[PDB]
Symmetry: D2
Subunit: 258 residues, 4 copies
């Protein structure tokens, strides 16, 4: 079947809405999971290890590399799930707000992948299918939206970085697959904040009209649940996805395709 | 839970072909009940619970598939439209009837088959919260054009767009049927073999080795796919794990379309 | 800058909403225009010739080729603008309805381009920039929609045929550019009928709710006017577009990109 | 007709290969052109004004706004053409190289558009078709490539920022169109440097094999000339493009579509 036997997996933002479900799903497929987030401690069901980890910190990433190096000697799967959103009027958004979003959503992938690259190369030797790097983009990386300039721009950067790394790692013979994941509206605190800030900005009349409008834009007719992200990430991390690199893996209830 | 097809009644067309045989094996391995169909009057398809002779261009052929599924199971949970053909031709020497022949196998198959199995797919939609799953075999050729592949590419773009429309329509009508398109890159099957040889005979390529190396180098991963590398993706789309996936382009192309 | 001096242009569906504006725009850029449509006669402003022409008829296309051959000896620009739409429930749509839409929207381009290919090759020798074939696809060729299965499928076929012919004509050295045009909601009888059938199908509560919904899906916030298609087609037909082939040329008020 | 009569246009990187052709083409369509680049002085054919302008400098942009405000009272067209490229091995690329490319290619558009927004709103009142913002992305913003991680990521950011601003400015009623332009391989010093650095990196055996490979990846079979970018930018800046916003305008010889 589709499984993660003998897969050492790093999952960032692992205490968040999607992150907790990714850890559960990956443990259920038999992965060894190093879960990381900003809290000094967390109870992440399915994590074999929890590390305090700011994805903007090279030192934080070196601590992840040290634990993986010491305990396992490789990383087979790297899930860059940590990210933030802001909802703002472009003309009232200082350059520093774009930079803050870029640092969390994009620099995290650049720093993390550079620091774990020796360990990912070892995973490329451990499985014929390759090591697997899974970057959380968004439907916002595919389709623009009013008031989401900073967020959408960062998620398009994540998408394109995924294509470039997939092509480069294959050309250099590292046997490391890199793919971008594009969730639609998923029922988490992040989507909650975006909807509330849309109301305060006066993009939506009320939080109920906003919710109904966003749900109706999805052909499937509802928000996604965080658990509905799990199987896709397990697939991309598995040897079943050995021919999948540089790809836009969409889990959006049809949002981007209508 | 995990990614599995427990109590999934699956119809797979072109099931005796290079990819089709691996789809049946993969889906059986995930515990699906598989009705395999192809043009031969009989075939030994590893993992098939039933084999039916089935021309996907024939409404009567599809009604025989519906009758067996109706009688034995009362539903269809997964429908994999994998039957397809390719031609390689000079546009100016391609009669309208060659476009129509490719359209009939690659597109009309999905229209006729989905219409005939729709009552059974609606029952699939009631049997699983995630929905019935219709998986349409498009191509990277449905995403990116190519010289001398006008008839094939046009049909595979039609398959892709039909998938989006049916996903949106079945959701709007409340049927709980997911529809997605699959886009393989160059997969090592008799079909890829014939396309390369016919490219040589047409005088597109010097030799079969230069053709193969050129096609391999277009894939960032640096090689053609193996048929077995299609199996997991189709199992995922057919499973409840893909409950939030409809209208989607599911690409298995070694990076071909993205550089 | 952007002109069609010494350009012999064939425009199909030339009596329709967009077609009439294409002929006006192309005449205004100094093209010689052969206008064609289903009516036995028409007064098409800017046309140097009108021909009765069923785009599904090889004999109809041969009559267009004969007039162009006899009077000018070439075709520099071929605009495949003829098309139909239907709005239907998939499960109630006979295969013959898909085939009827395919015959007008796709077979027209196959038959017409094959019949005019000798004349387009002469266009290819007359201008460094090349002969130009402009195929009318749709945003419906880029994004799906409930109840538009037959229409959307045909317009995606038009889009992909455009890419294949652009690549093939370049590989064979014919100097013929081929591009697809993707209009959004344009205010013509065709959009009117689609909206009116959407109501009778019970897809929309009223035509006013349908119209407002469709207008709001366009970021620009309104339907296009037929005249807003003219400049884009003039550009693609001109030497200014000498580096444009196989391209999706979108005129959709941002519809496809959100 | 496609013209820029009474259009006040700002063009950045105006002394470059493409920039000089954009200024010539826009003057030929009767635009008033404020040309800007890094040099303290330059002889830019077709420019009514030249300003020294670092597109990373808020103060530099305020000087452009002051001249336009004083002399014309509006900006009708803003062409963000300034940009840089690097070719690097991801694992040897410091975070500061990504940031440098982002600052020139993306922050330029954020700072410039914020500073000129009052003047663009006046452009929006001067023409029913709207003010026009044209952002130079790349085929690199659509398709990834090995060794172009920093460049491709920045050009995908430019593409998505274009979609977001098009949607946002329309939602706020400012009547400002925003589009991204995606050139293929254009014969300029920038393409020259990329090809040479590809050889030094050992991505290509020789500069002749690199050149032939890049030319053959374009269906049209050659590099573009800078002049082949001019018509497209004139079209997007004109009232002929009144229904074009949020759009990917591709001038790539078919590169992205095969
Ligand atoms: N929920 C949606 O609708 C949606 C849609 C598109 C994509 N996404 C993406 O999915 C991913 C998961 O989002 P979510 O919905 O679970 O949101 P969430 O906010 O619940 O989870 C994000 C997690 O990232 C962590 N994080 C933030 N900054 C960090 C930093 N500097 N260092 C370390 N950890 C940091 C947060 O602590 C949080 O636990 C994100 O990449 C998000 O952008 C979400
Ligand atoms: N191999 C590749 O490189 C490649 C690339 C992209 C897409 N695909 C698609 O994958 C699918 C499977 O292809 P494959 O490579 O295994 O090809 P294949 O030729 O090995 O198998 C296709 C099967 O369809 C059957 N078939 C043909 N016409 C039929 C009809 N009228 N009724 C019933 N069955 C019919 C054939 O007999 C065959 O068993 C096709 O849709 C193909 O277009 C393959
Ligand atoms: N209006 C829109 O919203 C919209 C949307 C996207 C695409 N388009 C496309 O733009 C093009 C122009 O359409 P329009 O909106 O002006 O519609 P229209 O119906 O006003 O014009 C289309 C013309 O095609 C002609 N035609 C139909 N069948 C023909 C045949 N067999 N032979 C010859 N001529 C035939 C009709 O006589 C008519 O004059 C079409 O291809 C259409 O699908 C329009
Ligand atoms: N030439 C190609 O093949 C190609 C490919 C795709 C995209 N592009 C894009 O086209 C645009 C123009 O490219 P080109 O080939 O003319 O490049 P070029 O190097 O010839 O011109 C770019 C100009 O930008 C200017 N510039 C650089 N940094 C600046 C700064 N901080 N402030 C102000 N001006 C600055 C340079 O001085 C130069 O004159 C760029 O945005 C480039 O990314 C070009």
């Amino acid at each position: 079947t589709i499984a993660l036997n003998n897969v050492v997996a790093v999952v960032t933002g692992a205490a968040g809405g999607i992150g907790r479900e990714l850890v559960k799903a990956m443990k259920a497929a038999n992965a060894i999971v190093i879960a990381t987030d900003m809290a000094p401690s967390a109870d992440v069901e399915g994590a074999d290890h929890y590390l305090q980890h700011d994805v903007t910190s090279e030192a934080g990433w070196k601590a992840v590399a040290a634990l993986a190096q010491e305990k396992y000697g490789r990383v087979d799967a790297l899930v860059h799930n940590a990210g933030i959103s802001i909802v703002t009027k472009f003309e009232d958004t200082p350059l520093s707000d774009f930079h803050r979003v870029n640092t969390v959503n994009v620099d995290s992938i650049i720093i993390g992948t550079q620091v774990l690259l020796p360990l990912l190369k070892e995973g490329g030797k451990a499985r014929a299918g390759g090591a697997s790097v899974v970057n959380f983009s968004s439907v916002g990386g595919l389709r623009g939206a009013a008031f989401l300039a900073a967020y959408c721009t960062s998620k398009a950067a994540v998408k394109m970085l995924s294509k470039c790394l997939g092509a480069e790692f294959a050309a250099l013979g590292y046997n490391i697959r890199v793919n971008s994941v594009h969730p639609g509206g998923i029922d988490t605190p992040m989507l909650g904040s975006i909807m509330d800030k849309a109301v305060e900005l006066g993009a939506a009349p009320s939080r109920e009209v906003a919710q109904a409008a966003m749900e109706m834009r999805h052909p499937i007719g509802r928000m996604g649940r965080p658990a509905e992200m799990g199987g896709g990430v397990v697939y991309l991390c598995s040897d079943a996805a050995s021919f999948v690199t540089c790809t836009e893996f969409v889990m959006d209830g049809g949002f981007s395709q209508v």
